[PDB]
Design a protein around this ligand. Structure first.
Ligand SMILES: OC[C@H]1O[C@@H](O)[C@H](O)[C@@H](O)[C@H]1O
Length: 614
């Protein structure tokens, strides 16, 4: 039964932004026309709220007191005139700057001459105050100057976040911070708590190129960091290409489907003045929007890929027994794709399936659902009225500390944290699972009665898991339920007692595996497939670098590619052999410490070549 209410958490931003269609070629008239078309198309009623002015409004000029100055030939009345126009339509206004001394308009000019000085470094408080005073509700802070200068992203965006907070506090106007640093230095590790959204990869589309499904899928894959997203903090796979020239209606729907299953921001990027009726309908689908904006705030995850390129993604929705599902076909042929209740963390009990594009219920099942999916296409479903897998419930064993937390398998779990926050403001806490990288959790007002917020966490098989909270409201118990589709295994070295680990949750192709203290993080949870892959993050394969066949060959992660160097035999003697090479996974020089490199080596009887994988 439902006995403690789920507290709604903030959704990702919805709106439109000027970059994808206009590059730096923007002025007051360009923005005004898009606002008018946005309104005319009925986007506001569907939930689209932000009109975001991206790069090109500012050429780096400041007055003698350091105040940003604009060219009023392009921005008549100054920037407060465009915010006034946007606000006049009941919408929110966004602006754009850089973390460094000079912006992307300087480092990578794209439609205009280089703009030296187009960044906010040395002026964070000044500029944030200025944006808020002008009437901006949103600010996207880019990284061209940060990257150029060699800045540390985590500490730099903390400083920026603090300045954003002070500016909003001074004016009384909330300011939504978008961190835009392209997945450099792993923002999934640190951005939650600093900002409601952070870019997880490089740009979905570049100036002068045509929209690409390959690029779209790459951005989608790189945005999946389910432990980092929760309670109003979101991974950002970038601005929508929906409705841009070259994309068909089906590719537009697939674009919406994948952003929605992530719970990503829906920031339209097409030219709204020439948008078709069909495109507007795709942006406005309320059932797909409701999935994207789900009140529980969680990120969808891959739950099945029994056949290469035929994938099922599941998202845990608000309430109990409710899921959204995307069936995605990355192959060149139409194929059936099945999602099983077991993989979704439901029991084998009746549930209703609905197709969100057909807007019709399409059947019931106590076990699963199969649909035909076109080559390169997708189907968007909900599965509702299901029965949840049995959860564990825990009471804290000391202040803010939950111990003995149990998982049948290593992998992803949904945790509901009970608490009371009988004030008018959200409070935050730091959450750390085992020895993993910590995260920040937000706790919205509850009234006098307790409520829950939810987080996804990665746990180790067994009953040795700990969840520790620091700061924030006293919690009143946790509930833990597994998502079996995400099941993996720690790969633990016999000699070292340490786990095969990818440093600091890095996803970059070619990153070498290492030994590290076992903590059950996503960067330690390996899924062994029927294709003999050892898969990390749902989408990276343990890989003998460049198909190396001799001693000392580096073992890395790489996009899964079906090659023999990504295939592994898990042998009865405790060895793990690379299929291509016949060599053993090996902790280099039989070292046992954190940071010991994993390599391939000729198989022997040494315990630095012995592993447990359950
Ligand atoms: O020049 C502006 C562009 O700069 C890139 O760094 C950013 O990722 C894009 O989304 C756009 O803002």
């Amino acid at each position: 039964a439902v006995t403690t209410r789920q507290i709604t958490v903030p959704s990702a931003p919805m709106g439109w932004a000027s970059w994808n269609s206009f590059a730096a070629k923007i002025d007051y008239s360009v923005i005004k026309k898009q606002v008018d078309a946005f309104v005319a198309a009925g986007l506001p009623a569907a939930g689209y709220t932000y009109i975001n002015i991206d790069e090109g409004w500012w050429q780096g000029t400041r007055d003698s007191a350091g105040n940003i100055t604009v060219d009023t030939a392009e921005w008549p009345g100054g920037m407060s005139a465009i915010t006034a126009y946007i606000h006049s339509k009941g919408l929110k206004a966004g602006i754009y700057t850089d973390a460094g001394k000079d912006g992307c308009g300087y480092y990578y000019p794209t439609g205009r001459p280089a703009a030296p000085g187009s960044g906010s470094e040395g002026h964070y408080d000044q500029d944030m105050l200025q944006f808020s005073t002008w009437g901006f509700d949103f600010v996207k802070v880019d990284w061209c100057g940060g990257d150029a200068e060699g800045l540390d992203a985590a500490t730099t965006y903390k400083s920026i976040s603090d300045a954003v907070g002070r500016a909003a506090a001074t004016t009384g106007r909330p300011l939504t911070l978008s961190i835009c640093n392209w997945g450099y230095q792993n923002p999934w590790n640190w951005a939650a708590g600093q900002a409601p959204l952070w870019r997880t990869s490089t740009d979905i589309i570049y100036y002068g190129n045509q929209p690409s499904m390959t690029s779209l899928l790459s951005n989608f894959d790189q945005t999946l960091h389910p432990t980092a997203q929760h309670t109003g903090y979101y991974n950002d796979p970038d601005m929508l290409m929906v409705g841009m020239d070259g994309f068909t209606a089906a590719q537009n729907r697939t674009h919406m489907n994948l952003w929605a299953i992530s719970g990503a921001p829906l920031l339209a990027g097409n030219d709204l003045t020439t948008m078709t009726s069909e495109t507007a309908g795709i942006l406005k689908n309320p059932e797909v929007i409701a999935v994207d904006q789900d009140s529980r705030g969680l990120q969808g995850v891959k739950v099945a890929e029994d056949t290469t390129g035929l994938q099922a993604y599941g998202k845990v929705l608000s309430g109990t027994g409710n899921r959204a599902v995307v069936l995605l076909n990355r192959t060149s042929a139409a194929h059936d794709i099945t999602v099983r209740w077991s993989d979704l963390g439901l029991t084998n009990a009746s549930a209703t399936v609905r197709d969100l594009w057909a807007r019709q219920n399409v059947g019931t099942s106590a076990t699963g659902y199969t649909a035909s999916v076109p080559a390169g296409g997708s189907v968007m479903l909900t599965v509702t009225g299901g029965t949840e897998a049995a959860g564990g419930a825990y009471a804290a064993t000391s202040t803010g500390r939950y111990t003995g937390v149990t998982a049948a398998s290593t992998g992803l779990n949904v945790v509901d944290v009970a608490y009371t926050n009988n004030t008018s403001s959200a409070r935050t806490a730091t959450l750390q699972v085992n020895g993993q990288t910590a995260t920040t959790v937000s706790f919205p007002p509850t009234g006098a009665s307790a409520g829950t917020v939810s987080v996804e966490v990665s746990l180790s098989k067994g009953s040795a898991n700990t969840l520790a909270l620091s700061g924030g409201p006293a919690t009143e118990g946790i509930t833990v339920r597994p998502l079996p589709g995400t099941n993996g295994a720690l790969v633990t070295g016999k000699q070292s007692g340490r786990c095969a680990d990818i440093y600091n949750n890095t996803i970059t192709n070619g990153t070498q595996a290492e030994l590290w203290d076992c903590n059950g993080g996503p960067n330690q949870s390996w899924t062994y497939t029927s294709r003999k892959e050892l898969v990390l993050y749902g989408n990276k394969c343990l890989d003998a670098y460049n198909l190396g066949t001799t001693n000392g060959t580096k073992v890395v992660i790489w996009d899964c590619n079906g090659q023999a160097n990504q295939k592994w035999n898990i042998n009865s003697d405790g060895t793990i052999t690379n299929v291509n090479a016949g060599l053993c996974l090996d902790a280099y020089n039989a070292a046992t410490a954190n940071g010991t490199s994993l390599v391939l080596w000729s198989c022997g009887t040494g315990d630095n070549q012995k592993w447990t994988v359950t």
